[PDB]
Symmetry: D2
Subunit: 277 residues, 4 copies
């Protein structure tokens, strides 16, 4: 009295699209990742300068995605190594690299699949990179299965070990302290890109935030993604213990330095930590 | 009111986390499977190169590219190759291979794109036509007959045949489903397409609706290297007579048709029961 | 981290709201179906009453009670009836009927309870035994063979047979699956068990595994009364072949029985021209 | 590339258990509804007394369930008509009536299936009842599909139309204002029935755009677990919701665990029982 499937989950076959690849939600989501490849001048400006003032040439993007950020760094003469756990995501970055393969810069761009929970064996780095970047509020995608945030610790741990001694780590996340408080996603302010009907859902388990779900809509169909609502306080100690303390933490609020008490409400918090030992 | 809640929509990815069901046990054994199939027998290679040279083909379209095995061989032998597949999961391996051999001139000229038989006419720039179109590995049988009138089969064949230039060649095969349907079991492991250095056990399920064979589901039980698991795939059981009619009709009859049984010419009623039927069609013009 | 979230667990109910999938389109068509089946043909009734009287049966156990149609007939004809089924959804209609006719002395004495063939021994108080045990309407074929060795079938039949007192009777039937398996189609609408005043169109699916028939799925397309609308529901069965079943039911008695088989209420002779839609096995327990 | 099912959802077959009726969750859930069929003395005391002081004899239980509440009223001489949308729930009520069928009182007990959203056509009352009861926080089981609480309005409206002019309507709900604030629903903090089963309850609150939308409860017992969801009604909104069901022609009144509720009061009730007396 069960249900028989035509083909095992995760199995592909020549000649037919992979499972759910042509679904309604997938289509809308396609437009989303596609109509966001266009970053903001301010962001690009902040990022380029930030890495300069630290003497960084070898960059590791651990949340590669479609490689929009990584592509910029390649064009700017950086030595880029892009990684992600999502092959569906990587497909776009790899397609871009092949198209611009004639440009010596792109031919040297390294794109590989890796998972934060096994980033150590998946990516042989040895010494470390001058900078490890994880932007776009991607870390929050990693949920908490066991409920003790053990996976969060392992993820940040491995992401940190990738930063060479005296190296820089730029990891961000949305402002969930404010989302949990208002139960809504901040205004449609154009900060990270110039790209909607977003329903926000907060799930609390025993009064402790556990997950934030977003239902993106466009006109007749929609798609959703869930996030672990990291709060500035806990995240600040979370990323620091990833190093053990040997670092110089700093927090930005939409690119400008964040000042506890400050009147302005940031949309995102960018943590810049400079590894020491 | 019962209802299924989702953390993320089906088919949606997010940076930093493995896709939908990429790490399930089934998917893992299957990956070992495609890993042990990346090799062709010498007999197969010689037959395919022989057929192509025999007709003087140069521009070849591989519509069931898959991981690229056949396409790579053709690239190495100096043909002009365009490989296409509807599965991104499998195309991934072909693209990876092309990138690693990016420096070899012939590989820098290897065209690989996503395309669906059902919308081939638009997914790929045709008009010109290819000297030869190949669809091997019993790939066509992966397409189900959802509507029940085989309309999708006809639309796929038609589009595939419209990629063949006048006087061009079409090579397409399928397992011998007449034998499977009559004995209810896939023939015992032999497969002369590739050398399987990994033992297998196939459980065969045949679904017949109103007495018409509709689907054949295969449960492949692979012997995991030092550690037994399995994965499942389904096929439309195309029979010789019906397929013969189907592929000719996709040319409007404007073609020369012949069929091989495991690389050798096939004669109706012959004692030797082939595991694969290969239809070779020479388009009139 | 993909995972399905639920509002309520499967199989759980809550007052004030309809159960799981009680109002779906399939469940609604299916309900119309059982409603148009609540009637037997005169020929079926005469045959069943005739058989029971012919062996002087008084205490009857209907192990596939369903909505209770056959049971109700027996209650009315004066038999001592105990009706049992494993499906609460179907037992609901039999219980409703008994309650409405509760004033009639015979119905107040009609026993209806929940019981599973697999645990029949404990679900119902036996020991004594019943004069006749009936399992009709091709109900037995609903039990699948999950394990693949028919152990469930053997367990169910043995439990069903143990309800038959020595010298007692067991009547159990099944559709003609030999025909279905060889033609791949259920026979064209006739069904001599009941009068179907509702048009149907049956699509037949046969699943064979390693060449052994394993399941037959029937999609019933019912013509919804005014909507000339068409909807359908699906149900599966274990394709029991005559020879196999014959062996199976006798072994449920350890061979201690007299066996005969009818083809649509008439004696069946292997090789006869008439191909029956149903096979009814009638066994007289030795003791 | 989809999934073929053996049988259609909601379709039963003689000889085999209905779908999911034998699952792990269904079992644990069975114990839950069974080890609660034993109400509290304070509750009974309260209920019986309440209906007496109003001159009620014909009672309609619109959230019948396993019939525990109705059974009590039948034993007390009330003319009872029990109704519920859940056939799996009614099964227990019906089985109890049949076993006590020999007692005249139970022979007159009417148990039928009806849905709040169609209570008008499902149940022909015409005149009405002296009292309509919906306790055990059952109304909260009705979710809000369209998101505008229209179903809630229709449900309460039909339930109210069942109360005869000058009649009584006793409807309740847990204290969600407090559960939303603490994010937890005290496991065992009942008042209607003293639970004798060990339970570990995990509370999940789901907020959609900062507006409470649903509370989910994961009941665990010893290794197995099941869950149910509720629409978290707040005293304020519910209070206007039940009143607009009549239109305002009634005398609202609120209790907190049987004792009258006084806004400001220090005691935090577990349940709020709204006793409205229809006028026009
Ligand atoms: Ca056949
Ligand atoms: Ca039936």
């Amino acid at each position: 009295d069960s249900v028989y499937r035509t083909r095992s989950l995760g199995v592909a076959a020549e000649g037919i699209p992979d499972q759910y690849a042509d679904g309604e939600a997938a289509r809308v989501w396609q437009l989303y990742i596609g109509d966001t490849r266009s970053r903001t001048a301010e962001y690009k400006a902040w990022l380029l300068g930030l890495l300069r003032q630290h003497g960084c040439h070898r960059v590791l993007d651990v949340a590669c995605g479609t490689g929009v950020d990584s592509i910029m760094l390649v064009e700017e003469g950086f030595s880029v190594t892009s990684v992600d756990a999502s092959d569906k995501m990587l497909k776009y970055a790899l397609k871009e690299r092949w198209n611009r393969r004639k440009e010596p810069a792109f031919d040297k761009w390294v794109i590989e699949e890796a998972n934060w929970l096994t980033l150590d064996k998946d990516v042989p780095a040895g010494d470390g990179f001058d900078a490890v970047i994880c932007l776009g509020n991607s870390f929050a995608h990693l949920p908490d299965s066991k409920g003790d945030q053990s996976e969060h610790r392992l993820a940040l741990k491995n992401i940190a070990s990738m930063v060479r001694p005296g190296g820089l780590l730029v990891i961000d996340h949305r402002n969930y302290d404010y989302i949990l408080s208002t139960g809504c996603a901040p205004p449609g302010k154009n900060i990270y890109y110039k790209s909607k009907d977003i329903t926000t859902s907060v799930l609390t388990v025993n009064n402790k935030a556990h997950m934030v779900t977003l239902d993106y809509t466009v006109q007749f169909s929609k798609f959703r993604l869930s996030y672990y609502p990291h709060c500035l306080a806990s995240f600040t100690e979370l990323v620091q213990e990833a190093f053990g303390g040997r670092c110089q933490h700093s927090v930005l609020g939409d690119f400008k330095p964040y000042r506890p008490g400050q009147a302005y409400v940031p949309c995102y918090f960018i943590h810049v930590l400079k590894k020491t030992g």
